[PDB]
From Swiss-Prot:
Its cofactor is Mn(2+). This is Phosphoenolpyruvate carboxykinase, cytosolic [GTP]. GO terms for molecular function: carboxylic acid binding; GDP binding; GTP binding; magnesium ion binding; manganese ion binding; nucleoside diphosphate kinase activity; phosphoenolpyruvate carboxykinase (GTP) activity; phosphoenolpyruvate carboxykinase activity. In eukaryotes there are two isozymes: a cytoplasmic one and a mitochondrial one. GO terms for biological process: cellular hyperosmotic response; cellular hyperosmotic salinity response; cellular hypotonic response; cellular hypotonic salinity response; cellular response to cAMP; cellular response to dexamethasone stimulus; cellular response to fructose stimulus; cellular response to glucagon stimulus. It catalyses: oxaloacetate + GTP = phosphoenolpyruvate + GDP + CO2; L-seryl-[protein] + GTP = O-phospho-L-seryl-[protein] + GDP + H(+).
Amino acid sequence: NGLDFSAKVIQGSLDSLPQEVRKFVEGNAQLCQPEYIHICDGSEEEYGRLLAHMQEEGVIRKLKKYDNCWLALTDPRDVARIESKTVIITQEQRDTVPIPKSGQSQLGRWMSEEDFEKAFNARFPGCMKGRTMYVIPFSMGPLGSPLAKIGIELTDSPYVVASMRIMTRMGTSVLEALGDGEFIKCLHSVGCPLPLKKPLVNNWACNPELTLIAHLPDRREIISFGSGYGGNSLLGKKCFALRIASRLAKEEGWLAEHMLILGITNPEGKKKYLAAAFPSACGKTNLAMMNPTLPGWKVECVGDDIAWMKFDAQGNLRAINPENGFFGVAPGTSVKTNPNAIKTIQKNTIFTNVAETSDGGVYWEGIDEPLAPGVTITSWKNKEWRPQDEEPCAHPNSRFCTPASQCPIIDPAWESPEGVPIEGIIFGGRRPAGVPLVYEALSWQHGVFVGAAMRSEATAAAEHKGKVIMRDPFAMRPFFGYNFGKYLAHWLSMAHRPAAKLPKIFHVNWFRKFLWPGFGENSRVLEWMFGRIEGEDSAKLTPIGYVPKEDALNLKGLGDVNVEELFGISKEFWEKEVEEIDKYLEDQVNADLPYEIERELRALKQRISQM
Ligand SMILES: Nc1nc2c(ncn2[C@@H]2O[C@H](COP(=O)(O)OP(=O)(O)O)[C@@H](O)[C@H]2O)c(=O)[nH]1
Ligand SMILES: [Mn+2]
Ligand SMILES: [Mn+2]
Ligand SMILES: [Mn+2]
Ligand code: NA
């Protein structure tokens, strides 16, 4: 009877699969030994029954206050991305990360093919025993689009299948769009075959000790073991659309970036599109769907996390959002801070590690909504919670997984397969001191240097504690698919291609100490950027780049804001900054640092010495 798993197919048919899709499914069905195989069709009925099954299994809880919303609570050991267990396999180490002068590289983690094979054999054989292998055909980008890249995710987590339905275009239509074309091979398992050898915490299957998120770009495979958290288990998102995609992008002449895409319209009706790279949990989602406080202005959301970008024939940098939803940080989200998000997350939305009110609603730190007297709160740890306990009701990296199409200000061209023309790129992070509210790069090369110099306080999105200022060039430290030096060269090369309308490059700091209220008020910084792209004489030259002139920023309704402190450029801070950037780039980028980046470093060092 061959290696035929037709007898265990519980939805769909192996005969209906493309030739190479069948081999991929059956080959891993042989390795992983699932009891059932569920080929996903992506239908509403499948989604409802999947949620009902998880509810019956005690995996998720229904939120009775809302329209088809659900709550998952995880094992506390499996709450975020884990960079130290995140690896890229290549033949040569140099292709994946530059060879550092000292210790280990901070720009990724390389693992040899031999090392990974042994790790792979220690984990995956029989790992799905007693479980259903779900087969997820998903499209990153819109269905039909020649830009879109299709993947097949195999997983034993129904939480992953439900989340992938939101975060990607998922179903039978993807298999029909694929045919005998190429697809990314995504393999995932929580790593707890039945019968369970280890006790199960919060009904959340996971394997912390053996957690491993591997990328094999040469083989076009993503292999992920042990973790159910979205960043580690939704393999279309970070693993494919940043790590695997950024390498493909380098090879084919496009860009895959950790960037929101937004459209901003002035009072007249003139529209511009901006992209912005901030590190995980440093303000992308809130900016991408902001409610602008300036009257007449209008922000619209194309995407909040991943941008795929390429020059068209006319020289416009065209961006698309390859995702289908927002996997956004929960705490802080309110009608004050992010009202467009709240209109999105009230239906067809899955929440993870947030608190639950007794009347079937969600709760977290900074929700800015006092409860009725008598309404009690169950925490993310499934305990009865009160502020007398010093612990927060929701985990810091708790999430909502919501459809993008439900955003009130979703851009009418967000599914356009030609993309939206980018006229501005914004870099930034959490710098509590020294860095101005906004500056503008002097050229493309300086702009690329500014991206490379980026630093930001650590967040709960990965394993890093203490709120320490880490290096995060382009907000891509955890996501480089290949050598960062080559990545810099790829970016710099975009200046050389004829007729290229290069976006203006800016750097922002919302988080200086906060000296700036942020959220909707950042529309004032976006106004200045809008004008500078138009070419208004609203900029003053400083050593670090152009800053807004006196009376350039609309601060009407904000006379209290200290402009001197917020835009202060200290020689003492900045001569220290360039020294720290020098040592980092030499240590970590080393022989693969392009000359032009070193020239901008020497030029910035020079300008600071003249202060
Ligand atoms: N102070 C301040 N906080 C912000 C701002 N934008 C977002 N945040 C907060 O920082 C966290 C991350 O924001 P988010 O937009 O979700 O970051 P993302 O993960 O990069 O999309 C949330 O808890 C927000 O409340 C801002 O402009 N100022
Ligand atoms: Mn992100
Ligand atoms: Mn986000
Ligand atoms: Mn050049
Ligand atoms: Na659970």
